[PDB]
Amino acid sequence: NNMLPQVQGQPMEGENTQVEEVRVYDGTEPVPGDPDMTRYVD
Amino acid sequence: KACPRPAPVPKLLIKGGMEVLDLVTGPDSVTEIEAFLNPRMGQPPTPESLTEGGQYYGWSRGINLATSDTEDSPGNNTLPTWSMAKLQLPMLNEDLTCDTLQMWEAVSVKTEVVGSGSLLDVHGFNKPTDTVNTKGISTPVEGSQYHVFAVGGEPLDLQGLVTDARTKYKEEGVVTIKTITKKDMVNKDQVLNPISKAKLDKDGMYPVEIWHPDPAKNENTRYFGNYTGGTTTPPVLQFTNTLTTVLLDENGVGPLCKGEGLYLSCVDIMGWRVTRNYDVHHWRGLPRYFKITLRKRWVKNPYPMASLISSLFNNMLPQVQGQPMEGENTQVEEVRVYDGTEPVPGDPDMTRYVDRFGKTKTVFPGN
Amino acid sequence: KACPRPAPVPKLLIKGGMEVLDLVTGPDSVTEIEAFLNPRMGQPPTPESLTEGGQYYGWSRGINLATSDTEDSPGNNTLPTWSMAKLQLPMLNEDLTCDTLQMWEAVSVKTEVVGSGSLLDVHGFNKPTDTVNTKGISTPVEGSQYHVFAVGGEPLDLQGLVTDARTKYKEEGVVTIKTITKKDMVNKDQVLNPISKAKLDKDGMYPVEIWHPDPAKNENTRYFGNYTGGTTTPPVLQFTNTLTTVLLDENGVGPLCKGEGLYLSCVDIMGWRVTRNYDVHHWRGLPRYFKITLRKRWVKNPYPMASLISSLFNNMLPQVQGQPMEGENTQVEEVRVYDGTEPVPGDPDMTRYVDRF
Amino acid sequence: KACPRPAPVPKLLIKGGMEVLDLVTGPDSVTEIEAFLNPRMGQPPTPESLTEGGQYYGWSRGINLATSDTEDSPGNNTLPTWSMAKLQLPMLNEDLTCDTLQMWEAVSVKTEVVGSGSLLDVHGFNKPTDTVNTKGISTPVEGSQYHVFAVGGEPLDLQGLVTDARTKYKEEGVVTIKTITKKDMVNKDQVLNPISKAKLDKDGMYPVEIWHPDPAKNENTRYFGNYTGGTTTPPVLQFTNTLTTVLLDENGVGPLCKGEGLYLSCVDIMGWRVTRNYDVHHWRGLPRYFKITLRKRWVKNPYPMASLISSLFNNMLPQVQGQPMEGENTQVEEVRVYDG
Numbered sequence A: 001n002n003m004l005p006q007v008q009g010q011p012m013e014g015e016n017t018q019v020e021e022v023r024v025y026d027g028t029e030p031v032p033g034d035p036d037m038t039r040y041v042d
Numbered sequence B: 001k002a003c004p005r006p007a008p009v010p011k012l013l014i015k016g017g018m019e020v021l022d023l024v025t026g027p028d029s030v031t032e033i034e035a036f037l038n039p040r041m042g043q044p045p046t047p048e049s050l051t052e053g054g055q056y057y058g059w060s061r062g063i064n065l066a067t068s069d070t071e072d073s074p075g076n077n078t079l080p081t082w083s084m085a086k087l088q089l090p091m092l093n094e095d096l097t098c099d100t101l102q103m104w105e106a107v108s109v110k111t112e113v114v115g116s117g118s119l120l121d122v123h124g125f126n127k128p129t130d131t132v133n134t135k136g137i138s139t140p141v142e143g144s145q146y147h148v149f150a151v152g153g154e155p156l157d158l159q160g161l162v163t164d165a166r167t168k169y170k171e172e173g174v175v176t177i178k179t180i181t182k183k184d185m186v187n188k189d190q191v192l193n194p195i196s197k198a199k200l201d202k203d204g205m206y207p208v209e210i211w212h213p214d215p216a217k218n219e220n221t222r223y224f225g226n227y228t229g230g231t232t233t234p235p236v237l238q239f240t241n242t243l244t245t246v247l248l249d250e251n252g253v254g255p256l257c258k259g260e261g262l263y264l265s266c267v268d269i270m271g272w273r274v275t276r277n278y279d280v281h282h283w284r285g286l287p288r289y290f291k292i293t294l295r296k297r298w299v300k301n302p303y304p305m306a307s308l309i310s311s312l313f314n315n316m317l318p319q320v321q322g323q324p325m326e327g328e329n330t331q332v333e334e335v336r337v338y339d340g341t342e343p344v345p346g347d348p349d350m351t352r353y354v355d356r357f358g359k360t361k362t363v364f365p366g367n
Numbered sequence C: 001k002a003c004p005r006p007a008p009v010p011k012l013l014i015k016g017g018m019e020v021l022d023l024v025t026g027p028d029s030v031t032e033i034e035a036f037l038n039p040r041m042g043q044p045p046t047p048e049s050l051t052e053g054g055q056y057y058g059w060s061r062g063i064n065l066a067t068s069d070t071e072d073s074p075g076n077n078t079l080p081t082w083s084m085a086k087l088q089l090p091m092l093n094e095d096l097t098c099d100t101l102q103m104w105e106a107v108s109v110k111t112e113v114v115g116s117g118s119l120l121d122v123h124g125f126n127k128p129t130d131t132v133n134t135k136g137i138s139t140p141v142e143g144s145q146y147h148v149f150a151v152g153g154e155p156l157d158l159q160g161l162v163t164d165a166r167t168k169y170k171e172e173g174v175v176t177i178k179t180i181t182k183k184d185m186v187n188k189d190q191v192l193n194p195i196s197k198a199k200l201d202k203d204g205m206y207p208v209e210i211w212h213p214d215p216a217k218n219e220n221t222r223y224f225g226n227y228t229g230g231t232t233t234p235p236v237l238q239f240t241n242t243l244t245t246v247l248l249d250e251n252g253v254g255p256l257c258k259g260e261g262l263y264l265s266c267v268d269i270m271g272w273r274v275t276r277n278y279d280v281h282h283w284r285g286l287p288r289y290f291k292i293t294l295r296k297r298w299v300k301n302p303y304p305m306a307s308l309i310s311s312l313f314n315n316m317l318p319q320v321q322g323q324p325m326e327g328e329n330t331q332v333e334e335v336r337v338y339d340g341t342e343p344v345p346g347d348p349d350m351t352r353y354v355d356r357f
Numbered sequence D: 001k002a003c004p005r006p007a008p009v010p011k012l013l014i015k016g017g018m019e020v021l022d023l024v025t026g027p028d029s030v031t032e033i034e035a036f037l038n039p040r041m042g043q044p045p046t047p048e049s050l051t052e053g054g055q056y057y058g059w060s061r062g063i064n065l066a067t068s069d070t071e072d073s074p075g076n077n078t079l080p081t082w083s084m085a086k087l088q089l090p091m092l093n094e095d096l097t098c099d100t101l102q103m104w105e106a107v108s109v110k111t112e113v114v115g116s117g118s119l120l121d122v123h124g125f126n127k128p129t130d131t132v133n134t135k136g137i138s139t140p141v142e143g144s145q146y147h148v149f150a151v152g153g154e155p156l157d158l159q160g161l162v163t164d165a166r167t168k169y170k171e172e173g174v175v176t177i178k179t180i181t182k183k184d185m186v187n188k189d190q191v192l193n194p195i196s197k198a199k200l201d202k203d204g205m206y207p208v209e210i211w212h213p214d215p216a217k218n219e220n221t222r223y224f225g226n227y228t229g230g231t232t233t234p235p236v237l238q239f240t241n242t243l244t245t246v247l248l249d250e251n252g253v254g255p256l257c258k259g260e261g262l263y264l265s266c267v268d269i270m271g272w273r274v275t276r277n278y279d280v281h282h283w284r285g286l287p288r289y290f291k292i293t294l295r296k297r298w299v300k301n302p303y304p305m306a307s308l309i310s311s312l313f314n315n316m317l318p319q320v321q322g323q324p325m326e327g328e329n330t331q332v333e334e335v336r337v338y339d340g
């Protein structure tokens, strides 16, 4: 981080990060149905 | 019970934003980061109002021409600038034992520029198709276009070459070859100035017109793009969530974020819009998406612990200042070393050296 | 006896319409649905009279040109909007007693746009080749063209970016950032507006001029298409039924019609036809066809009967309103979860991020 | 042995023409057929002289224009029409014992359109480069070009879609949607009318401006082609003997000739020639070659003797008209079935 100059660069953290999403995987689960359906509340 | 077992897909731990990262992953554990950079060329965000910034957002302000051969001052919003950012990642593990560490290793990236659809708004006030009666279509985005981008484990090493070394860029709010190198540009810059090389230390700052992905003999970024010159030239684009690209390197490496930072960098001109008003020819860009897939890779540590440890611990000693025991005037006229025990030589004032590999009874003085 | 043996081919079960679906398939049963959609940019079908609707069906009605910088009122039928629909497949399974469940899963698909031939009519009244003596050819379609499409398991996810935020889309009669976001446009919509994201819930409603296949980091659709700008740009196409395309995913998956939906969506601008009158262009689009190949696939159950039954739990109590324990004002200062057991760490709230140092 | 034997290659049996077919092939006997189609768009062959038919043969006649909106009447020679033909093959062997049949199966085909060079005559009286001082080059062909073709084992299925649905096509001397749906066009046709579908049967009759290879649910033809619109769009083309194309189906079948016939179909607009006169426009076509490679393939009879005989008998026998021998006035009084 020393040899590496300091930026300034768009927001990839913060309140307006332009990071749309992230995910992590470590396993091997059998093809789930709707991978995205949990705790329902409006 | 034995209700047939579905296909084995990789299991997602958790998803969400960067923080998801925070969670200990493990070692094969992969991370997908979708993000994007907005196109920053000219008119910056800030005047959120569509009146004061006339919301020329994501647009070259107007086109500041030049006096004549002698005087070329372009406005700071007549200057599409490289758009970029850096993602900050977690820190992984060590094993000073095996002097090896794991780093964030980027692999493939899907990317996409969006908004090609926008270039179908054909009402509004652009030069009409039929000037005469002032009819037609409010003439679409046309002209040169440029799209480049990269991805790396450190910012982008670039090189500048400009059209005219005489251009009156500002010393202010943009990084020019001058801005980086004090001394004004010369004809060399105008073609390949091996000096005129910077870094992406900033953003929305080095304009494309100047700075280019320099093929440093060395690189941990993967970049690419292309130019498509012209004045009328039609824009063309690619809509697809189907393709992934390999940030992988030739040894099967891809980049690695030294500084747990991932670095995105890109540029996307579709061409100029043209005011019906006059020939205020200001250009437009679109934003780009990124889907970086990186793993955890084990790498032989570069620089030796001890050195650092003790390179540090020695830089703490008081500073001394004092007479020269090195330099061009070392007050040391001498130094020998021995370990062995040969039997008495002959010539005592014999010299002795080892070089490039081999150790020699120095040439009998009298060559 | 030894008879010659014809090459084995997949044996047909039944051919026919949507009803053939109801036939009990089996499991490696394969289905070949084959449909298409009529390109809906501007002039809606309904007025079928070629006088009243002056039959512009399949054409941008007129081509309204705004007033000036501050004033841009497009006008609905000046708008090529996204065209889609949903093939509703039959339900495959009843094992929400065991986990495993099988559902419709799209694989490959052949698509094709047609009528690329109609682009050769050169009589009729269009600005002509030779204006002078009003002669030549009724000048053909040229201009910016555009085609995209997608095959997926739920509707297509979009994103808004637009040319001018001051544009005045009649909120009445077409989806638009505001109609979905209430608040008017902003300069951010003039670029990547992460808020300005919508779904393909409706149809021939989301003008393409605004809406885009958003690469929501998450997706069960496959879309593709391209923009070809230009004022006088020559149209091009691929009249052909030879090769297919794979909706298969990276893991060998393809879409899975959640719900039991097969969602087809696309757009095909060919450029605009320009009247021999004034310079009023008005785009033409062609229909696209689809040939989806889908199979039956096993997956882990997605439905927690719990939810169902726990829908009934929140009715053992009313709706509460009370302070925010979620939002931008969660008064939840913090949460941590523990499960295992590690030996004591030193500062366990380690700045896992380097720059925090 | 002592004499080096060279390489083996397929042993030709007979070169010739259609007649050649007849000799008894065998079962792996491959048959190659070269042929072609003359680009029938506009002026037909018949007006033999280049004075009376001003030998436009191979050219649209003149681009007839229109009144405006309320009226557009094309003119039968202002219309390049689909071109096609049918190769008549001979019947093969069977083995009802195993309800197996042998049929003609198209495999690959080298096709090539020639005459690309013709486009290099820049004299003659087309408008010229410099019109001002009537000097330069008599402007070559330019404009929209279209090339599509198909090799099928039954006629080509096709769907009609048109631009303006009013277009007063001359209902006679050319198939139009009306010529087939027995009624007048509708906005729907103007975009995809599922009714507006038909077949190739004729030729030099189905205008291209109207019919397009329809991806029928099911198909025994391979088609391909592309449109390259535009007004001044430059022509381009492929001169090659070298490469082949495979009619082979998804499981390697290609087409089979329903009826002992092989079907060819295509169109090749190169664009148009404009006359040094007014903006008289008429398009130019080019002919196409075809080297179809086909084989003897075994199939299952997918039908049932009995009935297929029955059909035959029926198809053979006229329809009649017959006093009511059933219905409400059956002049049949009675029937008895006795056994024994």
Ligand SMILES: CC(=O)N[C@@H]1[C@@H](O[C@@H]2O[C@H](CO)[C@H](O)[C@H](O[C@]3(C(=O)O)C[C@H](O)[C@@H](NC(C)=O)[C@H]([C@H](O)[C@H](O)CO)O3)[C@H]2O)[C@H](O)[C@@H](CO[C@]2(C(=O)O)C[C@H](O)[C@@H](NC(C)=O)[C@H]([C@H](O)[C@H](O)CO)O2)O[C@H]1O
Binding pocket: B054, B056, B061, B062, B063, B064, B073, B074, B075, B076, B077, B078, B275, B277, B280, B282, C069
């Ligand atoms: C805001 C403004 O108009 N400033 C004047 C400058 O004109 C504008 O210059 C901009 C670039 O700086 C853009 O090109 C402007 O184009 C647009 C625009 O987006 O603003 C294009 C739009 O299409 C148009 N919109 C409409 C609806 O017409 C707008 C519109 O006019 C405005 O948005 C307001 O409605 O215009 C273009 O008009 C003018 O170029 C600058 C000159 O700036 C400098 C320079 O050369 O950089 C600044 C220097 O500091 C100055 N020197 C000193 C010592 O001060 C020099 C110097 O005066 C010059 O070299 C000699 O003339 O000029 O002046 C503004 O007044």
Ligand SMILES: CC(=O)N[C@@H]1[C@@H](O[C@@H]2O[C@H](CO)[C@H](O)[C@H](O[C@]3(C(=O)O)C[C@H](O)[C@@H](NC(C)=O)[C@H]([C@H](O)[C@H](O)CO)O3)[C@H]2O)[C@H](O)[C@@H](CO[C@]2(C(=O)O)C[C@H](O)[C@@H](NC(C)=O)[C@H]([C@H](O)[C@H](O)CO)O2)O[C@H]1O
Binding pocket: C054, C056, C060, C061, C062, C063, C064, C073, C075, C275, C277, C280, D069
């Ligand atoms: C159906 C009709 O005639 N409506 C009038 C509008 O004219 C038509 O507007 C359409 C878009 O709304 C198209 O641009 C029309 O173009 C075509 C078409 O119908 O598609 C193009 C065709 O090629 C052409 N065919 C031929 C053979 O020429 C047809 C043809 O001309 C017509 O079918 C019959 O002649 O035309 C175009 O003709 C007219 O634009 C609207 C006004 O719209 C509004 C608006 O901004 O939404 C309505 C507001 O209520 C009005 N406000 C007030 C206070 O009057 C504003 C306002 O006047 C405007 O901002 C300033 O003028 O305009 O009126 C219809 O009568």
Ligand SMILES: CC(=O)N[C@@H]1[C@@H](O[C@@H]2O[C@H](CO)[C@H](O)[C@H](O[C@]3(C(=O)O)C[C@H](O)[C@@H](NC(C)=O)[C@H]([C@H](O)[C@H](O)CO)O3)[C@H]2O)[C@H](O)[C@@H](CO[C@]2(C(=O)O)C[C@H](O)[C@@H](NC(C)=O)[C@H]([C@H](O)[C@H](O)CO)O2)O[C@H]1O
Binding pocket: D054, D056, D060, D061, D062, D063, D064, D073, D075, D076, D077, D078, D275, D277, D280, D282
């Ligand atoms: C041979 C001829 O000129 N016949 C008259 C028609 O003119 C020709 O029409 C063709 C299309 O039908 C082409 O457009 C002709 O263009 C060319 C051509 O002959 O191919 C283009 C050539 O390049 C050009 N050669 C040169 C060197 O320029 C030739 C050249 O002019 C000829 O070789 C020599 O003259 O021209 C074009 O000339 C004309 O279009 C028709 C009228 O059409 C109809 C109609 O449908 O509207 C035909 C109807 O049958 C008729 N109805 C009745 C009841 O008679 C109506 C009706 O008469 C009309 O509306 C009112 O009079 O007209 O007439 C031919 O005689």
